[model samples]
Target: SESLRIIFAGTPDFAARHLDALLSSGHNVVGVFTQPDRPLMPSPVKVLAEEKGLPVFQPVSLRPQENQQLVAELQADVMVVVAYGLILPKAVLEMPRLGCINVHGSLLPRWRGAAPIQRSLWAGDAETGVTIMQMDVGLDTGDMLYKLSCPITAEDTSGTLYDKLAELGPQGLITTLKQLADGTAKPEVQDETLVTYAEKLSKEEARIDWSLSAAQLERCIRAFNPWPMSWLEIEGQPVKVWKASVIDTATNAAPGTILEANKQGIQVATGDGILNLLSLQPAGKKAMSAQDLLNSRREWFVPGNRLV
Candidate 1:
């Protein structure tokens, strides 16, 4: 067997998992390239962070002259990248013998940009999957080598879907590598008409809009969790919504108006139906059940106070 020298490049937990699998499968990963860790907290409380013992290259530029010099130094037969968060210039793309192969988080020609998993859940897509491709200079616009489909369950949150994709990706990567090594891997041309980008989410989009249908609002709450969390204003204070669901009960109150508050949850009127806020985090406090919030801030939300 010819020694397969691989240079692994990735960042974040998803990428780390793939590197772990490759090492476990006995691949000769000569080196690793990950993003340099920056400050974790805001200014005045700044604390420097470092990657967990990986050879990280935080280059200010990925141009051919800069990155190609580094790539040539590695001298690896293949480059495996996943969520590296850096664009590969043309010179870098042609550095390794087999070029760079990427384990992308979504099916080819769809959700082709960053934040695919979160965007998929936010848009209420029924399905999403992983794609292994021969990396190119374009943004995820590469020839696909392999794919593995995964269904999106109705209750699947962004955090939950991320874990599933991480598990599925490594297995798919292994299979693709075997095919490539055996000279049996075939590349498929993607339909440009089907391509769509998954733009990064912003904190402004996380604000809950009671003017929308309850079902839509519920999905937003789930999709934006753990980052840019869904929030609303109550008594001039911010309240972060952690969990919620649509209720079928009739309500004549205006949208954003509180309909009921009790031990079960806090029900609010929406455009189409009622939304029950199951868990929430009040300003300057930890997340608590809707009942607990009501117990303390009973004066804030009555049966008719709006939540704008």
Candidate 2:
């Protein structure tokens, strides 16, 4: 009764960190479930479970009868789920002695859906954090167990914010397991009015629009980086914008108009001010700093050349 049996369910690097921490903790993690593997590529969670020799389940969906039966057979005291792609039917939620708990990337009752980290950045949210919740049928509409938030600085990209939350997540999850084992954790229902959905990122969404304010567009360029990166096409040449900043200087030039280009960066006119692009990648080219890119492509960003 002291060391509760835990079944870990997760995918990707974020979830993998939690699984790693759990494996080192006092809790007895009995099983691991990850998304279906690809032909050659494997998930971090899957790889870690295999290395540790833990019993692993790679089912496409837990909705299947056999999958649910196997999960029930684990006789787990609780399931610690993080970023697992599959939906948990009511049946599997009841399979574990304790209802499944999820380590979500945003504060409860806000950004309560997919792509929370990206949505928070894209929305220019001032603060974002993690929530440990008891799972329910609705989309992340669950009772809360614990929550902690981190700031969303203007300098943070999807990658950096993701790292901090992922690092902070394990500590929260660690304390939660202890509380749950001791029956000290309390569940609190989430407020319906505070809920906002974080829909999945689309390729279309990654395409930047120059019409928005430089500040707003700058956030867009950063938030989607190294994933579905913010991009634009110029003279039919697709270019990726990896790093950017909002310059306070007002520009009379038309939106998407290239105001200047140098080793420093490409300054493009936006709705309000100049959006200084500091890093970029041409289609079929590797990413490089704006300074390095200026070496051979001086004409590519000549003034008056638009980036629509």
* Candidate 1, superposed: residue stretches over 4 Å from native: 1-3, 40-56, 249-252
For residues 1-308, could you state the per-residue lDDT of candidate 1 as single tens digits? 44567888777778878888887788877677666455642211011112224344556467648665787788888889988767788888888888899999888788999878888888888888899999987888889999998988868788888899999999999888887777888999788999989988887888888888888888888778777889987777888899987897767788999888988888999988999989999878989997888788887678788889
For candidate 2, which ten residues in a row score worst on lDDT?
A: 290-299
TM-score of 1: 0.91
Best by lDDT: 2
lDDT of 2 by residue, 184-243 (tens): 998889999999999988878888789889998888887887678899876687888888
Each candidate: RMSD: 3.8, 1.4
Q: In model 1, what are the clashing residue pairs, if there are any?
A: none
Best by TM-score: 2
lDDT of 2 at 86: 93
* Candidate 2 residue 194 C-alpha distance from true site, Å: 1.0
Q: Which pairs clash in model 2?
A: none
Our model 1 lands, by Cα RMSD against the true structure, at: 3.8
